[PDB]
Enzyme design. Structure first.
Site, PDB file in Angstrom:
ATOM      1  N   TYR A 312       0.830  -1.192   0.000  1.00 16.14           N
ATOM      2  CA  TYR A 312       0.000   0.000   0.000  1.00 16.14           C
ATOM      3  C   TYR A 312       0.868   1.246   0.000  1.00 16.14           C
ATOM      4  CZ  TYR A 312      -4.069  -2.842   1.189  1.00 16.14           C
ATOM      5  OH  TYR A 312      -5.083  -3.766   1.191  1.00 16.14           O
ATOM      6  N   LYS A 321      -2.692   8.528 -10.552  1.00 20.95           N
ATOM      7  CA  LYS A 321      -3.953   7.834 -10.316  1.00 20.95           C
ATOM      8  C   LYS A 321      -4.841   8.578  -9.330  1.00 20.95           C
ATOM      9  CE  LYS A 321      -3.959   4.212  -7.825  1.00 20.95           C
ATOM     10  NZ  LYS A 321      -3.646   2.841  -7.361  1.00 20.95           N
ATOM     11  N   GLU A 380     -13.747  -2.145   3.217  1.00 24.66           N
ATOM     12  CA  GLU A 380     -12.373  -2.604   3.100  1.00 24.66           C
ATOM     13  C   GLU A 380     -12.243  -4.009   3.648  1.00 24.66           C
ATOM     14  OE1 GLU A 380     -10.483  -2.383   1.456  1.00 24.66           O
ATOM     15  OE2 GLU A 380      -8.436  -2.803   2.111  1.00 24.66           O
ATOM     16  N   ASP A 407     -16.737  -7.764   2.926  1.00 26.40           N
ATOM     17  CA  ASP A 407     -16.723  -7.832   1.476  1.00 26.40           C
ATOM     18  C   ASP A 407     -17.812  -6.964   0.878  1.00 26.40           C
ATOM     19  OD1 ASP A 407     -14.598  -9.380   0.922  1.00 26.40           O
ATOM     20  OD2 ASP A 407     -15.736 -11.094   0.165  1.00 26.40           O
ATOM     21  N   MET A 408     -17.441  -6.186  -0.133  1.00 27.35           N
ATOM     22  CA  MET A 408     -18.435  -5.458  -0.906  1.00 27.35           C
ATOM     23  C   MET A 408     -19.544  -6.375  -1.388  1.00 27.35           C
ATOM     24  SD  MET A 408     -16.083  -4.996  -4.209  1.00 27.35           S
ATOM     25  CE  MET A 408     -16.936  -3.490  -4.570  1.00 27.35           C
ATOM     26  N   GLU A 423     -11.457   1.185  -6.935  1.00 21.15           N
ATOM     27  CA  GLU A 423     -10.215   0.971  -7.677  1.00 21.15           C
ATOM     28  C   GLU A 423      -9.778  -0.472  -7.494  1.00 21.15           C
ATOM     29  OE1 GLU A 423      -6.413   0.807  -6.918  1.00 21.15           O
ATOM     30  OE2 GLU A 423      -6.730   0.147  -8.957  1.00 21.15           O
ATOM     31  N   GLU A 432      -8.374  -8.974 -12.051  1.00 19.58           N
ATOM     32  CA  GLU A 432      -8.398  -8.955 -10.601  1.00 19.58           C
ATOM     33  C   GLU A 432      -9.805  -8.820 -10.061  1.00 19.58           C
ATOM     34  OE1 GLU A 432      -5.790  -6.549  -8.429  1.00 19.58           O
ATOM     35  OE2 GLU A 432      -3.958  -7.412  -9.285  1.00 19.58           O
TER      36      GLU A 432
HETATM   37  C1  YFU Z   1       3.926  -8.027  -7.791  1.00 14.39           C
HETATM   38  C2  YFU Z   1       4.385  -7.183  -8.977  1.00 14.39           C
HETATM   39  N1  YFU Z   1       3.515  -6.046  -8.846  1.00 14.39           N
HETATM   40  C3  YFU Z   1       1.945  -6.279  -8.259  1.00 14.39           C
HETATM   41  C4  YFU Z   1       1.451  -4.949  -8.241  1.00 14.39           C
HETATM   42  N2  YFU Z   1       1.312  -4.651  -9.256  1.00 14.39           N
HETATM   43  C5  YFU Z   1      -0.003  -5.076  -9.777  1.00 14.39           C
HETATM   44  C6  YFU Z   1      -1.252  -4.238  -9.420  1.00 14.39           C
HETATM   45  O1  YFU Z   1      -2.232  -4.585  -9.924  1.00 14.39           O
HETATM   46  C7  YFU Z   1      -1.393  -3.149  -8.480  1.00 14.39           C
HETATM   47  C8  YFU Z   1      -2.176  -3.731  -7.241  1.00 14.39           C
HETATM   48  C9  YFU Z   1      -2.341  -2.606  -6.197  1.00 14.39           C
HETATM   49  C10 YFU Z   1      -2.341  -2.908  -4.685  1.00 14.39           C
HETATM   50  C11 YFU Z   1      -2.470  -1.952  -3.832  1.00 14.39           C
HETATM   51  C12 YFU Z   1      -2.617  -0.563  -4.287  1.00 14.39           C
HETATM   52  C13 YFU Z   1      -2.609  -0.313  -5.552  1.00 14.39           C
HETATM   53  C14 YFU Z   1      -2.459  -1.453  -6.586  1.00 14.39           C
HETATM   54  C15 YFU Z   1      -2.454  -1.215  -7.971  1.00 14.39           C
HETATM   55  N3  YFU Z   1      -2.274  -2.129  -9.006  1.00 14.39           N
HETATM   56  C16 YFU Z   1       2.131  -4.067 -10.092  1.00 14.39           C
HETATM   57  O2  YFU Z   1       1.806  -3.836 -11.179  1.00 14.39           O
HETATM   58  C17 YFU Z   1       3.210  -3.665  -9.796  1.00 14.39           C
HETATM   59  C18 YFU Z   1       3.604  -2.239 -10.126  1.00 14.39           C
HETATM   60  C19 YFU Z   1       4.806  -1.787  -9.814  1.00 14.39           C
HETATM   61  C20 YFU Z   1       5.782  -2.699  -9.095  1.00 14.39           C
HETATM   62  C21 YFU Z   1       7.166  -2.186  -8.721  1.00 14.39           C
HETATM   63  O3  YFU Z   1       8.092  -2.802  -9.037  1.00 14.39           O
HETATM   64  N4  YFU Z   1       7.367  -0.951  -7.990  1.00 14.39           N
HETATM   65  C22 YFU Z   1       6.294  -0.090  -7.541  1.00 14.39           C
HETATM   66  C23 YFU Z   1       6.496   1.280  -8.178  1.00 14.39           C
HETATM   67  C24 YFU Z   1       7.930   1.723  -8.009  1.00 14.39           C
HETATM   68  C25 YFU Z   1       8.863   0.671  -8.572  1.00 14.39           C
HETATM   69  C26 YFU Z   1       8.723  -0.598  -7.728  1.00 14.39           C
HETATM   70  C27 YFU Z   1       8.381   3.359  -7.960  1.00 14.39           C
HETATM   71  C28 YFU Z   1       8.242   3.240  -6.553  1.00 14.39           C
HETATM   72  O4  YFU Z   1       9.457   3.704  -5.844  1.00 14.39           O
HETATM   73  C29 YFU Z   1       9.134   4.770  -4.991  1.00 14.39           C
HETATM   74  C30 YFU Z   1       8.050   1.856  -6.325  1.00 14.39           C
HETATM   75  C31 YFU Z   1       5.444  -3.937  -8.820  1.00 14.39           C
HETATM   76  C32 YFU Z   1       4.061  -4.433  -9.208  1.00 14.39           C
HETATM   77  C1  SAM Z   2      -6.008  -3.073  -5.626  1.00  7.94           C
HETATM   78  S1  SAM Z   2      -6.182  -2.522  -3.917  1.00  7.94           S
HETATM   79  C2  SAM Z   2      -6.322  -0.741  -4.137  1.00  7.94           C
HETATM   80  C3  SAM Z   2      -7.332  -0.172  -3.161  1.00  7.94           C
HETATM   81  C4  SAM Z   2      -7.143   1.297  -2.831  1.00  7.94           C
HETATM   82  N1  SAM Z   2      -8.171   2.099  -3.464  1.00  7.94           N
HETATM   83  C5  SAM Z   2      -5.782   1.783  -3.286  1.00  7.94           C
HETATM   84  O1  SAM Z   2      -5.683   2.777  -3.993  1.00  7.94           O
HETATM   85  O2  SAM Z   2      -4.752   1.203  -2.971  1.00  7.94           O
HETATM   86  C6  SAM Z   2      -7.917  -2.897  -3.621  1.00  7.94           C
HETATM   87  C7  SAM Z   2      -8.268  -2.975  -2.149  1.00  7.94           C
HETATM   88  O3  SAM Z   2      -9.636  -3.277  -2.027  1.00  7.94           O
HETATM   89  C8  SAM Z   2      -9.868  -4.233  -1.025  1.00  7.94           C
HETATM   90  N2  SAM Z   2     -10.730  -5.247  -1.627  1.00  7.94           N
HETATM   91  C9  SAM Z   2     -10.334  -6.155  -2.558  1.00  7.94           C
HETATM   92  N3  SAM Z   2     -11.400  -6.910  -2.890  1.00  7.94           N
HETATM   93  C10 SAM Z   2     -12.464  -6.488  -2.188  1.00  7.94           C
HETATM   94  C11 SAM Z   2     -13.767  -6.913  -2.157  1.00  7.94           C
HETATM   95  N4  SAM Z   2     -14.134  -7.920  -2.925  1.00  7.94           N
HETATM   96  N5  SAM Z   2     -14.671  -6.299  -1.340  1.00  7.94           N
HETATM   97  C12 SAM Z   2     -14.260  -5.258  -0.549  1.00  7.94           C
HETATM   98  N6  SAM Z   2     -12.954  -4.838  -0.585  1.00  7.94           N
HETATM   99  C13 SAM Z   2     -12.064  -5.444  -1.392  1.00  7.94           C
HETATM  100  C14 SAM Z   2      -8.532  -4.822  -0.645  1.00  7.94           C
HETATM  101  O4  SAM Z   2      -8.261  -4.529   0.702  1.00  7.94           O
HETATM  102  C15 SAM Z   2      -7.508  -4.072  -1.442  1.00  7.94           C
HETATM  103  O5  SAM Z   2      -6.607  -3.507  -0.527  1.00  7.94           O
END
Ligand code: YFU
Ligand code: SAM
Ligand code: YFU
Ligand code: SAM
EC number: 2.1.1.320
Lengths: 625, 302, 625
Positions: A312, A321, A380, A407-408, A423, A432
């Site tokens: 996070y 974003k 959440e 869960d939503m 999101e 996802e």
């Molecule tokens: C495991 C590889 N994995 C997964 C994450 N997902 C998939 C994903 O769906 C995410 C899921 C998510 C979860 C919580 C909240 C928002 C989101 C948004 N979508 C990635 O796509 C992904 C992206 C970037 C990286 C990565 O290598 N880094 C992150 C970005 C930096 C480089 C290092 C710059 C920064 O340094 C300050 C850190 C690594 C990435």
């Molecule tokens: C991809 S992360 C990004 C969420 C957040 N808006 C952010 O910017 O990081 C999505 C978040 O939604 C929550 N989540 C995932 N699936 C869910 C569901 N089915 N119902 C409710 N919450 C969920 C999880 O805790 C996860 O941390």
């Protein structure tokens, strides 16, 4: 700086020569290990018995110098593919000798040429050397862009070259390398050293050699022009190529003699450093992504795992974003409530998937921007992050914000919702369980609610990549299908590859789905015109989105949102290379299968060849609901 | 002048009766070069009896007489250098060392007149020198692989040969707008030498031990024999009006060939690569051979 | 320095407290993550619904502070093994909660107690947490040396303790830990945090807890004595224990309140640093071996591989082996030639396995020492190193030295030999085909030749080791027997273990074998009196040697040659732990099998239990001839 070393063929004194190159500023040296003209016979006397030694003693340098500076060379006379049987056998023996002595010394890489088509015996000897003993030399298979037989000056009065259009006659060299590599079985210890001749080939071909594990570009001093001040410079297009290679972090080698006798020899390496300094700056995205190139990452389980706080935090530094989300909410709030009711109409959001709070803070910021009164929830799932949301809600947010811990799909909402900032977009925009999760959340969205995003699309582009194919290939694990590493998507910053065509829309999702029959299964047929002989090693995926009417997010390279590191691409491998011929059309099919419990993608190529239906029934990669 | 390096490369009799030993060190710590002049070649290769000698920077692949006191030397480095013998016949002095090629220099030879030179290096390019003014007049990149040999035309100042490892044999001319002339899918050629009397005959020795005898304007493989079971490293005609052809190969064997390619003499005197031979400018029955067994065995031929 | 952190149970302000400990000099902090007295019910209302939050917000520190400084604690009230069913279920839920929140925060380790025998449900919950999600917290299972029920003061007038001899009544605690660990299946993510009570147990037990992956020793401030100047110091035996642990690179924790109110609290950590500074210096051997502890290395193939130059170089810095060889050759030369013939009798050595030249240089040095004329050969199989020998022989050695390039077993010698300096001893003194190679070399040793070594022996000592067993266990590879990682010897600097008994001679070799029937097959029965309850995880091997009459080499710890790093021990695993009870006798058997092509060792335990004949027919580890 970028590495760079002198290619030599005259080292009378190894220590003196290496000292001189080090003073000139080079980092390493490519030298012969057995003397070049020292033809050693291993078959018949009395030449079989030339008394030793055979070469320079091991001790002329310390293990550290041998291991870090030097790079060996395979003697010119060795020709393991000559037709003469005697020369074939002598060359087999000599090449084994030279490679084993190179590994013994420790050299960090070994330079082997590809100067003709028939390289089968060479590949065999080299693979047999790769499979004997434990050693770590890496083999740079020097191969020119344009063959010698096509670089020559037209001076043979009796056998002039065929100047007419010879399309793949201009690509014979890449095929040389492709055959060698395929024989040696894509071994991660064979890499190219792309020679750069004075005249480059077309644009498509120089896109070809990328994606090919180029480990060092070899610049002769015969291609350096002379500037009015009397120093070498490279034409605009050569500079273009050199900048591409610099991106690819290759190690440039200055082979040849000094052709600028007015000035000492270091000027060439000075010029390479000059260009590297002047290369166009990396952008905001590439700055974040550095340290991540071609590194495969197993995607996330959205609903089965709880995201840990590092994740996070790191994804809360995204610069675009959250700005986009705030702008979208601002616009939607204005749209839904006019100016005059700005005090009587209270709009209730419900951020689904609130995480550690960033969407909810942005929602409150947007409500203040648009001067509208809102009542946020925050669903959440992750109970940990429910902890952080509780902390915010007690400390700062106040009664304005509710927090739900469920869960939503399962929560029972007190009052219906107008907007729902959610999101749950993945690397591939629907892998996802955003569709499923929001489809289970729309039962509490009013008959005219707004869902952000309102839509999101996915995109495929068929890539060729030796580095990434061999990456997937080395992604094997004990205790599973010996061929399931080729059936699951990998999140990766695709760097060293060759997109063979333009991305085309794969799966379009829109919300809410007030269609009477909710069905999240997708079938898609795509044709990607391939216009250069190459191989196809997988289909890369991207996505665009539509938060609100016009505010968008996207990782698709042509329209990439600026500095958005929240998402990398995705890489759908395929079980084998599909040798493709130019002009054909690569046809691929996706089914997005999902049952009551799970989800998964099934991908196949139905032309020019047919590949096995990959991941049938999600036996390799299913996203757990 | 401490010791002549273990590996002999070239030997050329001078007109007055002297010997010119080219010897580089292909093994050991230092890969260096060294020329050697003997006024009594029988005393060679014992350095203590050398009337002259000198070091270079790197190895000597082939060397030639230019006049009576000149020396043409091709370093492993890729720069041809001219070593004017001192008038006393006691010291050897460098004149120029022009770093012209981009990789090992594998041959040199002087045009018929004696004023220009040609070299060929595993940088496929062949060049032409002006020894008086000391620069390159022409740099033709004709072949498509390394240049394995060159032989200047004894009688026409504008004709030289050069075979390659891309199976081409080119008769050249310095006049024509397109100088190359492909004059024969067989075995790779590995050595050339013009006929000393009937000036339009030249012989290329192949990689499989078959001496040939091709006519430039006819190109019908005239007469060939598999005299050697391995690469024919050099061919050098005899000073007899009807000359014999010397044939030394990687097999460590030397033979003499006639106009019918009938064997006269076969010597296994050398216990490693025989690297080049020459006939006696005094005793036409006397031939000198130098090899990588460090021996210099004098042959009396029938 | 050695790590050390404060154990707390009172952190009103997380930031203030961590700042204070950092000023005091600690490195990390062990704190509760949910409040200690905050009993949370997960079953029945209305307590099931106490409104959040549940704990301190995630954001009070940055991911870096959470990850590097803090170590969590499992709340005291959680008792997943209480008898009450309600408390069992509540504790299951609470412990899962706390562990998952710890992993989310990122903590680098988690502190769990073992304060009673019945820990089965605790082990189950913990293993189910180890097998859910991808996380990297490591679990320190706090367990006291002497139980609370035996540390108490005798003040209960009606139920006095049983003071009489209770041998394993004094070991109940190690058994507590052993049962917990075996339930959780030796997971490499469970490690001990050995509490140190004021009164230590006997010597054997404190040898017990070593070999057990002790990750932090917990020193209360109740055990620190007061010195005349008014500061804490530890008795001589406590210092002995603390020095042992310091060797084991543990992280000491100062739990408890300040009992020296005269001085501020940092004095304790100052004392630990003082002791660490004063600990007896590591010896010459340990200095080299550092960075190598408990790191398993697959042994060498002596005859199938060519040793690379780094290896020769690094083993040419040994300070004792070459001195010993020179001394042995000196003595043998003197013995074989008297003073008067010192000029007429010329002795011909033949160093077999000359390597890069060290034995031959030492031989020439010894010939000069003993004023005797010698004619060395040097048989060296590795053709590369034949290159280095040729270089020496041309440059320096001269005609004095010959060099042969061929197998000792196959070379045909010009003239017979008098002495033969050979160094083909392995980690285990006969598991590198020294017997076979020299037995094939004695056909050219005169009827009164001398072979150096003249003998060499091997030694077994049955070790217990959780760290090394789990090391072998994590030595699995794809593409082979799922249980062959337990059938091959590993060269390793055995560090964290417990030798259960004294090494006993296993296989005695002497040279030359002028016995009429040369037979290199060995059978050996060994009994190792085990005198403390423990487990047996393998048999470690060592060796002694006899170069000449009295000059010896040895890696056997009791007589270890000084600073000899040329050989580490060997570790023969066994397929399962063999729970051993004190007073028994561990009986092990080796057969050294060898056929025309290969060699191998077969090892089994025939008491107190029986184990499978390991490595039958060399299916796991055979040394290629
Ligand atoms: C495991 C590889 N994995 C997964 C994450 N997902 C998939 C994903 O769906 C995410 C899921 C998510 C979860 C919580 C909240 C928002 C989101 C948004 N979508 C990635 O796509 C992904 C992206 C970037 C990286 C990565 O290598 N880094 C992150 C970005 C930096 C480089 C290092 C710059 C920064 O340094 C300050 C850190 C690594 C990435
Ligand atoms: C991809 S992360 C990004 C969420 C957040 N808006 C952010 O910017 O990081 C999505 C978040 O939604 C929550 N989540 C995932 N699936 C869910 C569901 N089915 N119902 C409710 N919450 C969920 C999880 O805790 C996860 O941390
Ligand atoms: C692979 C693990 N393996 C094998 C080597 N064998 C087995 C063996 O039979 C050798 C074989 C041999 C070969 C050539 C020549 C002499 C010998 C002698 N017998 C080891 O036992 C062994 C020993 C030590 C090490 C090791 O980790 N190091 C070497 C010693 C130092 C620490 C690092 C201090 C020094 O830093 C300057 C380097 C590592 C060791
Ligand atoms: C263990 S190493 C040590 C040798 C050397 N005395 C040293 O101190 O390093 C043994 C060497 O003997 C050589 N050798 C091994 N087996 C041999 C054999 N069977 N016959 C001849 N040489 C052998 C190998 O080259 C190897 O380098």
């Amino acid at each position: 700086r970028v590495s760079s070393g002198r290619d030599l063929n005259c080292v009378p004194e190894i220590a003196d020569t290496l000292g001189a190159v080090a003073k000139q500023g080079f980092d390493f040296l490519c030298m012969p290990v057995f003397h070049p003209r020292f033809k050693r016979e291993f078959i018949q006397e009395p030449a079989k018995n030339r008394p030793g030694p055979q070469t320079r003693s091991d001790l002329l340098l310390s293990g550290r110098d041998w291991n870090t500076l030097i790079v060996g060379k395979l003697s010119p006379w060795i020709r393991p593919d000559s037709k003469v049987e005697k020369i074939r056998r002598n060359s087999e023996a000599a090449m084994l000798q030279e490679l084993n002595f190179g590994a013994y010394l420790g050299l960090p890489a070994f330079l082997l040429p590809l100067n003709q088509e028939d390289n089968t015996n060479l590949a065999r000897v080299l693979t047999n050397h790769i499979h004997t003993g434990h050693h770590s030399s890496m083999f740079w298979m020097r191969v020119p862009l344009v063959a010698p037989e096509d670089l020559r000056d037209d001076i043979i009065e009796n056998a002039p070259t065929t100047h007419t259009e010879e399309y793949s006659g201009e690509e014979k060299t890449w095929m040389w390398w492709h055959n060698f590599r395929t024989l040696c079985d894509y071994s991660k210890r064979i890499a190219v050293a792309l020679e750069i001749g004075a005249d480059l080939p077309s644009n498509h071909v120089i896109d070809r050699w990328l994606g090919e594990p180029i480990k060092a570009a070899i610049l002769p001093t015969s291609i350096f022009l002379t500037n009015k001040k009397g120093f070498p410079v490279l034409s605009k297009m050569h500079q273009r190529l050199i900048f591409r290679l610099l991106k690819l972090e290759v190690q440039f080698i200055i082979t040849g003699t000094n052709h600028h006798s007015e000035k000492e020899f270091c000027s060439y390496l000075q010029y390479l450093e000059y260009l590297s300094q002047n290369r166009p700056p990396p952008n905001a995205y590439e700055l974040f992504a550095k340290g991540y190139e071609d590194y495969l990452q197993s995607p996330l389980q959205p609903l089965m795992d709880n995201l840990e706080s590092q994740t996070y935090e790191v994804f809360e530094k995204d610069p675009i974003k959250y700005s986009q989300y705030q702008q979208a909410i601002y616009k939607c709030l204005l749209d839904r409530v006019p100016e005059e009711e700005k005090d009587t109409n209270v709009q209730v959001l419900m951020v689904l998937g609130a995480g550690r709070g960033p969407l909810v803070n942005a929602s409150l910021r947007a409500a203040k921007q648009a001067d509208r009164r809102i009542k946020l929830y925050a669903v959440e799932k992750n109970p940990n992050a429910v902890v952080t949301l509780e902390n915010w809600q007690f400390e700062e947010w106040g009664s304005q914000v509710t927090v739900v811990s469920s869960d939503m799909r399962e929560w029972v909402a007190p009052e219906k919702a107008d907007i729902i900032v959610s999101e749950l977009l993945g690397s591939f925009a629907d892998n996802e369980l955003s569709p499923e999760c929001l489809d289970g959340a729309q039962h509490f969205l009013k008959d005219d609610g707004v869902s952000i995003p309102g839509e999101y699309t996915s995109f495929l582009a068929p890539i060729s990549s030796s580095k990434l194919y061999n990456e997937v290939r080395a992604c094997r694990e004990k205790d599973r299908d010996p061929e399931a590493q080729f059936e699951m998507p990998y999140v990766v910053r695709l760097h060293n590859f060759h997109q063979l065509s333009a991305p085309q829309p794969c799966f379009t999702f829109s919300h809410p789905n007030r269609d009477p029959m909710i069905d999240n299964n997708r079938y898609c047929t795509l044709e990607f015109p391939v216009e250069v002989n190459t191989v196809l090693h997988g289909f890369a995926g991207y996505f665009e989105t539509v938060l609100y009417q016009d505010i968008t997010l996207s990782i698709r390279p042509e329209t990439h949102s600026p500095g958005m590191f929240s998402w990398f691409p995705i890489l759908f491998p395929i079980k084998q290379p599909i040798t493709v011929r130019e002009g054909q059309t690569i046809c691929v099919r996706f089914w997005r299968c999902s049952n009551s419990k799970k989800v998964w993608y099934e991908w196949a190529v139905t032309a020019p060849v047919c590949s096995a239906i990959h991941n049938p029934t999600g036996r390799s990669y299913t996203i757990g609901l | 002048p401490a010791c002549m390096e273990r590996q002999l490369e070239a030997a050329r009799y001078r007109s007055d009766g002297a010997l010119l030993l080219g010897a580089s060190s292909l093994s050991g710590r230092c890969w260096a070069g060294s020329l050697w002049l003997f006024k009594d070649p029988c005393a060679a290769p014992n350095e203590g009896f050398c009337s002259a000698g000198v070091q270079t920077e790197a190895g000597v692949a082939d060397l030639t007489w230019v006049g009576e006191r000149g020396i043409l030397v091709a370093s492993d480095s890729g720069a041809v250098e001219l070593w004017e013998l001192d008038e006393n016949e006691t010291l050897i002095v460098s004149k120029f060392c022009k770093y012209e090629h981009d990789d090992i220099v594998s041959t040199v030879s002087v045009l018929s007149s004696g004023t220009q030179a040609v070299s060929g290096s595993k940088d496929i390019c062949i060049k032409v020198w002006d020894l008086a003014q000391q620069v390159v007049l022409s740099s033709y990149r004709a072949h498509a692989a390394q240049v394995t040999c060159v032989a200047a035309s004894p009688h026409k100042d504008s004709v030289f040969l050069s075979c390659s490892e891309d199976n081409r044999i080119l008769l050249w001319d310095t006049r024509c707008p397109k100088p190359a002339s492909q004059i024969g899918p067989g075995y790779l050629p590995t050595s050339l030498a013009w006929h000393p009397q009937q000036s339009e005959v030249f012989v290329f020795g192949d990689e499989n031990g078959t001496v040939s005898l091709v006519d430039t304007k006819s190109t019908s493989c005239v007469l060939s024999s598999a005299v050697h079971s391995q690469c024919v490293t050099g061919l050098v005609f005899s000073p007899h009006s009807v000359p014999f052809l010397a044939s030394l190969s990687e097999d460590c064997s030397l033979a003499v060939l006639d106009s019918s390619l009938s064997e006269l003499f076969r010597s296994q005197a050398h216990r490693d690569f025989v690297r080049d031979a020459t006939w006696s400018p005094l005793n036409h029955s006397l031939l000198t051979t130098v090899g990588w067994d460090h021996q210099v065995v004098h042959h009396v031929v029938p």
